[PDB]
Paper text:
The Omicron XBB variant likely originated through the recombination of two BA.2 descendants, BJ.1 and BM.1.1.1 a progeny of BA.2.7516. The recombination breakpoint is located in the receptor-binding domain of spike, and each region of the recombinant spike confers immune evasion and increases fusogenicity. Recently, the XBB variant emerged as a recombinant lineage between the second-generation BA.2 variants BJ.1 (BA.2.10.1.1) and BM.1.1.1 (BA.2.75.3.1.1.1; a descendant of BA.2.75)16. XBB harbors the substitutions R346T, N460K, and F486S, which were convergently acquired during Omicron evolution (the mutations in the non-S region are summarized in Supplementary Fig. 1). XBB.1 is the variant most profoundly resistant to BA.2/5 breakthrough infection sera to date and is more fusogenic than BA.2.75.
Interestingly, the structure of the RBD one-up state, which has been frequently reported in structures of SARS-CoV-2 S protein including BA.2.75, was hardly observed in the structures of XBB. S-ACE2 complex structures were reconstructed by cryo-EM analysis in both RBD one-up and two-up conformations, with resolutions of 3.18 Å and 2.99 Å, respectively. In both states, S proteins showed the conventional binding mode with ACE2 in the RBD up conformation. S trimer alone did not exhibit any RBD up conformation, it was able to adopt the up conformation at least in the presence of ACE2.
Numbering used by the authors:
A (entry chain C): 903 to 1139
B (entry chain B): 855 to 1051
C (entry chain C): 554 to 620, 640 to 675, 689 to 827
D (entry chain B): 753 to 802
Write the structure that this text describes.
């Protein structure tokens, strides 16, 4: 109820709809396993890490058999077959090639590590903000109005389950900025003036719940000769 | 160009303009309601009254000062084109990308004229003036130099791409937070109290 | 033919890139231009082999004269793909606004469609208000750490050759730098997980009776029956990643 | 050149990844909504130009 109250909905909305909300949450949680399983490439991000590491190691090991412009790629054969004053020239090419390969591998690893660290920082921030509290940043903890979240662990990563709130089943209405009565302008405290065609009510913004206009949910603060589009109707007390 | 090519982007400028126009129409005619579900209609003055109410000023302040606010907004919008045109280096950030790309490509193509301690810098001249047994010694130096140049260019490109990605992520976050809603973070979407973007 | 006014003493011509692009014929004094012959990459467009066996070929940055059957795009010459007018969500990107897909069954090329056209009936005395709500749950995946490694220079480069090591030590101290870089990477890999997960100092435990007013948390709470003490979703995630 | 090894495959893979990332950047920044809204023909918004 408090989490609903954080997004601008009263508590009686939850307290009179507990069963429906519980059932919707249960079904939404249930569908998650099938959604994850059916899609084959849902976890490509966590597989690319293993693929990249394996490919880099395989390339580095495979590079050992190259010649780099030498008689052969094995030191033991080059040494025994040839005179040493050719050997100290032939060894240098292999040494330089292998050193260059090592440097390339190390630089690639550093570049990948930077991106991995950035991703880890983002994940830590998301865990701090979406899970340990309620967030008001738009589209940071899901799509909709954030309610709460649950973390799960995966190999070389983390997985989040965001719970949100989505409106539905809207309707046409007619509205006015203020209500005039006895030459006094009236503005709503929280909500919007609304009319169904013949009567005028005041209701909250994210849920249709009409109320009788009263001095308790309005404040006067002005006159009736300034506001553009004012509509005059009786205000009860 | 000798083996150097430039590929066209996937999205043309017309499509990007269509995306921007759709975002503007949605935020004008719905507010922030279209960023979290179906779009819901609302008159613009009522939207702006809600946005003032979101920073600590009551609605009667807007409703009694509509014309003044509209005129100030119109003048502020009008001054933008002159401000952009007058300042010479207002768009240095976008020009630097093109300048750096051009510099890198020019240096890479210029590196093909180096000798790297050989008799000549042209392969055809080496082939047509010598015997294959005496050509590998010359060819190896050119091969090593050109490989080094390519590796340097690739490393620089990767390093630049990382920073470009960081900037793109920041831009995406700004679009999600300042345009599709109202931000209470200080100095994130301008200087002052944020209204809309 | 050329249009460059050579002075009576030049013979060649260059550009910014310092390459030959002009020459004069010795027998008949005439100015001629030199241009490289066309070249470019080749890309193959195919659906999965489980579905069909046909392919299409794109020659990047060449008009179709140099090489359904043919179609000219802004990216090059497309061969073996038929062009239609209908627009769908993009399947295989090709070039500047063009996509391809497999649709009795052939490979077609079209122009991508951005989205469904919509319009809201704006009026300055009208408003819309929702009357019903929906609760939705969505996922998000983020990498945290990767594999830690360490390399030994002498074993990798020389193996067990003494003279190879004796020549190698003459170069300098590159290997100390390599070791330092790898060690820093490994330490950062540990710190990433330590920062992400170690957020709380206590170890809370759920009550034995799992009644929370009608909410079912069986799919996320740890399962004591299995030895690994993992939730079913965690088990699925661990089994899918291989 | 064929004797040196497999540097070219690495170069090609790096450049291809860079290009794919470049496309994804714009795709992420701009393609936020999935509907194409259109502004009303009558451009009156209470006294504001747009
Ligand atoms: C609000 O939305 C919910 C979800 O669609 C509606 O719940 C359904 O109501 C019908 C009619 O009473 C039932 O037959 C369905 O079984 C309900 N669904 C579930 C999941 O329980 C609810 O009726 C809507 N509220 C209103 C006032 O229409
Ligand atoms: C909480 O949800 C789980 C998941 O559906 C329920 O477990 C199911 O219970 C039914 C009824 O006994 C079985 O037919 C299913 O096979 C169970 N599924 C699984 C995966 O075990 C569980 O009963 C729910 N808790 C309560 C108190 O109802
Ligand atoms: C919005 O501002 C524009 C620019 O001042 C107004 O359009 C101008 O209208 C006058 C008189 O019709 C013309 O002389 C100008 O040439 C127009 N400007 C341009 C750039 O073409 C426009 O009238 C304003 N909006 C409204 C609703 O009046
Ligand atoms: C609101 O009214 C407009 C015009 O009468 C209509 O097109 C629109 O569908 C209405 N809203 C709903 C939710 O039906
Ligand atoms: C509008 O609401 C009033 C108050 O309940 C009711 O008496 C009237 O019949 C309603 N009119 C319409 C058209 O729904
Ligand atoms: C009430 O509003 C109507 C229409 O706006 C207006 O004609 C009438 O004069 C108003 N009542 C009074 C007492 O002014
Ligand atoms: C295709 O080649 C022809 C050659 O005659 C040329 O006229 C035409 O301009 C070329 N198309 C493009 C797009 O360059
Ligand atoms: C769609 O078909 C029409 C037929 O009248 C044609 O004129 C138009 O060029 C086609 N659109 C294309 C090819 O993009
Ligand atoms: C807005 O109200 C004015 C009244 O001054 C009216 O002329 C205009 O038609 C209204 N807007 C629309 C879209 O009808």
């Amino acid at each position: 109820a408090y989490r609903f109250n954080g997004i601008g909905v009263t508590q009686n909305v939850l307290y009179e709809n507990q069963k429906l909300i519980a059932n919707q949450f249960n079904s939404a949680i249930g569908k998650i396993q099938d959604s994850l399983s059916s899609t084959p490439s849902a976890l490509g991000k966590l597989q690319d890490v293993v693929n990249h590491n394996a490919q880099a190691l395989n390339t580095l090991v495979k590079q050992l058999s190259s010649k780099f412009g030498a008689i052969s790629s094995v030191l033991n054969d080059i040494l025994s077959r040839l005179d040493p004053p050719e050997a100290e020239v032939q060894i240098d090419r292999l040494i330089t090639g292998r050193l260059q390969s090592l440097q390339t591998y190390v630089t690639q690893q550093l570049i990948r590590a930077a991106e991995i660290r950035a991703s880890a920082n983002l994940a830590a921030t998301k865990m701090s903000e979406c899970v340990l509290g309620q967030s008001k940043r738009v589209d940071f903890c899901g799509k909709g109005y954030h309610l709460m979240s649950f973390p799960q662990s995966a190999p070389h990563g983390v997985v989040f389950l965001h719970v949100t709130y989505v409106p539905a089943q809207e309707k046409n209405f007619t509205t006015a900025p203020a209500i005039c009565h006895d030459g006094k302008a009236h503005f709503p405290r929280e909500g919007v003036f609304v009319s169904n065609g013949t009567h005028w009510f005041v209701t909250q913004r994210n849920f249709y719940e009409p109320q009788i206009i009263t001095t308790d949910n309005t404040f006067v603060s002005g006159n009736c000769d300034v506001v553009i589009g004012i509509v005059n109707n009786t205000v009860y007390d | 160009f000798n083996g150097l090519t430039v590929l066209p982007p996937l999205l043309t400028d017309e499509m990007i303009a269509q995306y921007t126009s759709a975002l503007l129409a949605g935020t004008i005619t719905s507010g922030w309601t279209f960023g979290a579900g179906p779009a819901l209609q609302i008159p613009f003055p009522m939207q702006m009254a809600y946005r003032f109410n979101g920073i600590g000023v009551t609605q009667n302040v807007l409703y009694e000062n509509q014309k003044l606010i509209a005129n100030q907004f119109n003048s502020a919008i009008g001054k933008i084109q002159d401000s952009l045109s007058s300042t010479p280096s207002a768009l240095g950030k976008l020009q630097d990308v093109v300048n750096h790309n051009a510099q890198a490509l020019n240096t890479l193509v210029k590196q093909l004229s180096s000798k790297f301690g050989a008799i000549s810098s042209v392969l055809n001249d080496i082939l047509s003036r010598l015997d294959p047994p005496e050509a590998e010694v010359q060819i190896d130096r050119l091969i090593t130099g050109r490989l080094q140049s390519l590796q340097t260019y690739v490393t620089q490109q990767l390093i630049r791409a990382a920073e470009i990605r960081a900037s793109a992520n920041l831009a995406a976050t700004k679009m999600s937070e300042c345009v599709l809603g109202q931000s209470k973070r200080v100095d994130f979407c301008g200087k002052g109290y944020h209204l809309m973007s | 033919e050329s249009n460059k006014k050579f002075l009576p003493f030049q013979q060649f011509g260059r550009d910014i890139a310092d390459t030959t692009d002009a020459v004069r014929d010795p027998q008949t004094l005439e100015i001629l231009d030199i241009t490289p012959c066309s070249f470019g990459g080749v890309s193959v467009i195919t659906p999965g082999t489980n579905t069909s066996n046909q392919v299409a070929v794109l020659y990047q940055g060449v008009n179709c004269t140099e090489v359904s059957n043919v179609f000219q795009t802004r990216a090059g010459c497309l061969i073996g793909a038929e062009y239609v007018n209908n627009s769908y969500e993009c399947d295989i990107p090709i070039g500047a606004g063009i996509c391809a897909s497999y649709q009795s069954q052939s490979i077609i090329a079209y122009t991508m469609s951005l989205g469904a056209e919509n319009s809201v009936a704006y009026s300055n005395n009208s408003i819309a208000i929702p009357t019903n709500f929906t609760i939705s749950v969505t996922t998000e995946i983020l990498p945290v750490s990767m594999t830690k490694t360490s390399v030994d220079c002498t074993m990798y480069i020389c193996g067990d050759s003494t003279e190879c090591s004796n020549l190698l030590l003459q170069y300098g101290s590159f290997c100390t730098q390599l070791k330092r870089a790898l060690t820093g990477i490994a330490v950062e890999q540990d710190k990433n997980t330590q920062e992400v997960f170690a957020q709380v100092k206590q170890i809370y435990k759920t009550p034995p009776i799992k009644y929370f007013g009608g909410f079912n948390f069986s799919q996320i709470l740890p399962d004591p029956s299995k030895p690994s003490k993992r939730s079913p979703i965690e088990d699925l995630l661990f089994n899918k990643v291989t």
